[PDB]
A paper describes a structure:
Tmm7211 is a bacterial FMO which is able to catalyze the conversion of DMS to DMSO. FAD and NADPH molecules are essential for the catalysis of Tmm7211. The catalytic cycle of Tmm7211 consists of a reductive half-reaction and an oxidative half-reaction, similar to other bacterial FMOs.
The crystals of Tmm7211 belong to the P21 space group, with two molecules arranged as a dimer in an asymmetric unit. Gel filtration analysis indicated that Tmm7211 functions as a dimer in solution, which is supported by the result of the PISA server prediction. After structural refinement, the NADP+ and FAD molecules can be clearly observed in the structure. The overall structure of Tmm7211 is similar to those of other reported bacterial FMOs, with the root mean square deviations (RMSDs) between Tmm7211 and other bacterial FMOs of no more than 0.6 Å. Tmm7211 also comprises an NADPH binding domain and an FAD binding domain. These two domains are connected through two hinge regions (Ser163–Pro168 and Cys268–Leu272). The nicotinamide ring of NADP+ is located inside Tmm7211, and the entire FAD molecule is deeply bound in the protein. For NADP+ binding, residues Trp70 and Arg409 form hydrogen bonds with the nicotinamide ring, Asn72 and Gln315 interact with the ribose ring via water-mediated hydrogen-bonds, and Tyr170, Ser202, Ser203, Ser205, Arg226, His227, and Asn288 interact with the other parts of NADP+. For FAD binding, residues Asn72 and Thr318 interact with the isoalloxazine ring, Glu37 forms hydrogen bonds with the ribose ring, Val125 forms a hydrogen bond with the adenine moiety, and Gly10, Leu45, Trp46, Gly160, Ser163, and Gln315 interact with the other parts of FAD.
Residue numbers in the entry:
A (entry chain A): 1 to 444
B (entry chain B): 2 to 441
Amino acid sequence: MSKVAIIGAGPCGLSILRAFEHLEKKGEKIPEIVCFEKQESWGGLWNYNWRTGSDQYGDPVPNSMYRYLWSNGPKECLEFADYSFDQHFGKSIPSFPPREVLQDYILGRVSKGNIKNKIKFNTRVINTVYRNDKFEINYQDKVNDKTLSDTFDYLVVSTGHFSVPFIPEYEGMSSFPGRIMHSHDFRDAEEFRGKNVIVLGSSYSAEDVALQCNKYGAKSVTIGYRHNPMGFKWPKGMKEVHYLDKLDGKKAIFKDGTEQDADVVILCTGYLHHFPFLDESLKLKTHNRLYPPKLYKGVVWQDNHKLLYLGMQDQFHTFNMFDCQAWFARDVIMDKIKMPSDDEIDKDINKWVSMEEKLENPDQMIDFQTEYTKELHNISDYPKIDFELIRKHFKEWEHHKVEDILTYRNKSFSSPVTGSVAPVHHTPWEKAMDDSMKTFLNKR
Amino acid sequence: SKVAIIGAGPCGLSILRAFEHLEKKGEKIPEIVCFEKQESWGGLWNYNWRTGSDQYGDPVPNSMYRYLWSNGPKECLEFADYSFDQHFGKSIPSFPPREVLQDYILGRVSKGNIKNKIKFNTRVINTVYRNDKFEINYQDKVNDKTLSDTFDYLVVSTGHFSVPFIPEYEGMSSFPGRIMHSHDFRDAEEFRGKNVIVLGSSYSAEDVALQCNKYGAKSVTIGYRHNPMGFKWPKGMKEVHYLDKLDGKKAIFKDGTEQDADVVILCTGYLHHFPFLDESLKLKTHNRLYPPKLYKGVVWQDNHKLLYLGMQDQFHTFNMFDCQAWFARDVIMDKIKMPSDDEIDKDINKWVSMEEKLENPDQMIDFQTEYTKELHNISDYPKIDFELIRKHFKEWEHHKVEDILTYRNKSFSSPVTGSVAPVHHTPWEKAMDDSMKTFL
Ligand SMILES: Cc1cc2nc3c(=O)[nH]c(=O)nc-3n(C[C@H](O)[C@H](O)[C@H](O)COP(=O)(O)OP(=O)(O)OC[C@H]3O[C@@H](n4cnc5c(N)ncnc54)[C@H](O)[C@@H]3O)c2cc1C
Ligand SMILES: Cc1cc2nc3c(=O)[nH]c(=O)nc-3n(C[C@H](O)[C@H](O)[C@H](O)COP(=O)(O)OP(=O)(O)OC[C@H]3O[C@@H](n4cnc5c(N)ncnc54)[C@H](O)[C@@H]3O)c2cc1C
Ligand SMILES: NC(=O)c1ccc[n+]([C@@H]2O[C@H](COP(=O)([O-])OP(=O)(O)OC[C@H]3O[C@@H](n4cnc5c(N)ncnc54)[C@H](OP(=O)(O)O)[C@@H]3O)[C@@H](O)[C@H]2O)c1
Ligand SMILES: NC(=O)c1ccc[n+]([C@@H]2O[C@H](COP(=O)([O-])OP(=O)(O)OC[C@H]3O[C@@H](n4cnc5c(N)ncnc54)[C@H](OP(=O)(O)O)[C@@H]3O)[C@@H](O)[C@H]2O)c1
């Protein structure tokens, strides 16, 4: 008889709506659920949006995906246990599909029944306090420019953590005569054809953005790193150098002495966990990491067990980890899973944080998130899926990237749900200029 | 008595300055706290390379770009209590680059204890009125912490040209180039050799188009929805009717025009945006010379201790903000008494009715002149010749129609000291370096 609020209708918010649907479909009564989504439509980061900065209502644009974006990990690692690739597509498809394809898969899982009607779109949650055993929530109806209010027994935060950019300042930016942007701003790589591009950062965004710039015709691409280089086998017109010292006109100067003509600087420097719409007492504060503290099983807010965060960990696993988290959260809301004592909660949190701090390389991290996810998987209803296969897949994928960063997307992996082997795509990724679902799925 | 001011741009600084005049004379003044989300005072007059949102996730309020020059005669915006002659110590041309006017603005408030009243990197986030106090929450950005305090009076001076209005046009989802708003514009060199599309029909469209051309754009094409600006555009520039869609690197207009396009710059205006005010306190309006619900254009009709500065559309700027500020100060000080609710409503209607009838720039200049002159006579802001200013604006509009490329080369006389501006050593079209250093 509870009333449940969900903030965000991306993969995480959809995971929990889906978790609740499984129960309703079996005949179980479920709580009233309201899901707030600031975008026009569901899909979260998987929606492409030309917009940058803030929208027509002055709401910051949560979209970070760009044109020509392809799955950066094996799709088999993110398959839904309750909704297989074979079921959705009706045939086996390659392991690294373009964004539109995976978006289609995400929305397909939830588009058959009553989930969509539970979501309020163009609606931005702006304020949350907890009082008298209820979450009092203010939200903006954007189209009408109006503040609305309601009260809930449980609150699920699924707003992701890759939308609000962290944007550091370097010397000389005030006088740089080119574009300075964050990866969050990146939209169509053709913008930089024939240009000298500087990329700053050492993770997935730096890696992929650098490659897209080169692929879509940049004159040069130079990656700066602060601590250690990615060390991948970069294409001809690409180099990796240490630490940007300053910009001096159309000239980037690095600490290792490198001087590079620069037309654009793309800061691929990460994002903030940003929750301006939550009271300070409810607000998770953390940098991007595999296991932030104060989250029992990485989900339940330690100080308020009716506040549940989804997807807030750094990610190797994605979709099916979100599912495992969501099924867990559903079961907490349903009172199927009972919270242990305060001391046992704190002890369990410390166990995972301590392991997390000790992680030293991707193999250890992959093992860590595997064990985290598998433990979640065993406490609830989420269907059979082979996390051991997934563990192996991730490690193979890391090896592929080291082997050849240009060709890792051409590899084939087997489904941890159905066993199906992905066919090799008709077009090598390094030559695949058209990112449409149509050309991917059609022959030739 | 305790007063909060939100924003330390020209308007917030105008009121801090108004209160300072009194304190300097020996009058006791209220405790004043001014919140500013930027690192430093100056408002829009600060250049910031950042776009979108900052390192703390706070939307960037800066909209000015590199190579920006004053777009109206500086003699129309001179401070009555701090002349250009006083500040610069010699006559200088009428259209200075941004840094020059920024230096003038901050110079007026630099000498005293005003700066110490301002909390920087501090963003007001919530405002409610209860028990006769404004309860205000603000984020200390650097520490990522929410702080709270209570005030008797609230002055909102956060401008209205920071949060962009950004309309969608068919084809944007697949356009192979940059789509941006003028609010994003930073350095025109970014577009050298590029086919630029500019959408809009006001000051941002006009100046951005010219900046792109001046800094080597291969072409510039301006789309208008209702009416063209009609200025005498430079050789490589044209003005066409209504963008229909983008189809690849192709901009297609309703009048059939097809134009090669590498970048689309939406110069489509800004929102009055106050997420940090309770719905009951929040001004809702489009850009216009006289929004309703603002007594003398300043006092919130439904709460006479909430005062908005600078929220009108602008011909006048600095010295109008001043007149509004001196007014607001005197209201806060209880020198000026509010009239009855009915006389307030009648007075607002009087000005709104006039504002709705304005038909052309001349009538608008006359309107804002009268609005400003009336404010001027209710307080003690010093002598300044608004009649001369009225004339200057009309002359400037004429200059723009005559030649949009040369209007900044014109000279105007100070309405404060009578000083005649010298013609700058370099014509605007050829003035590439916007540094105050090289200007002076
Ligand atoms: C550029 C990029 C590429 C990526 N590529 C891959 C990939 O190839 N493979 C992979 O497995 N993972 C990828 N990821 C990881 C990605 O985070 C997850 O796949 C997934 O999108 C996370 O889903 P989520 O629901 O947790 O957050 P999101 O997908 O960000 O969804 C959050 C939703 O909440 C909404 N929201 C936010 N604030 C509010 C508010 N105040 N009120 C109402 N609604 C709000 C947002 O509009 C958004 O729709 C990528 C991430 C990024 C940024
Ligand atoms: C691109 C551009 C060019 C212009 N050029 C000219 C010109 O040449 N001549 C001319 O006369 N006028 C010009 N103007 C008009 C301009 O509005 C005024 O000159 C003046 O800047 C207005 O000052 P203001 O204090 O009212 O607003 P602003 O200058 O915008 O100051 C508002 C301040 O409030 C702060 N703020 C906002 N929200 C918050 C919050 N929640 N908490 C704390 N602080 C906050 C902002 O950081 C900002 O510093 C221009 C405007 C623009 C946009
Ligand atoms: N499907 C795709 O192809 C694709 C493309 C983009 C993003 N993604 C996803 O988007 C999510 C986020 O990845 P991300 O790379 O953007 O974030 P991230 O993994 O959190 O990495 C942040 C990077 O910023 C660097 N950094 C921090 N401060 C810096 C500074 N002051 N100067 C320079 N560098 C700085 C960090 O390295 P240092 O501290 O050593 O400098 C780090 O490498 C991930 O899920 C990723 O998979 C996928
Ligand atoms: N010193 C300088 O050189 C400098 C440079 C830039 C800005 N400024 C200042 O910035 C402030 C704002 O000027 P502004 O021009 O940005 O704002 P503005 O005066 O409010 O004008 C907004 C423009 O947007 C247009 N518009 C609205 N909706 C549109 C749509 N859907 N598609 C296309 N156009 C649309 C409007 O024309 P339609 O409705 O007819 O389309 C209008 O011309 C002013 O104070 C100005 O002085 C000064």
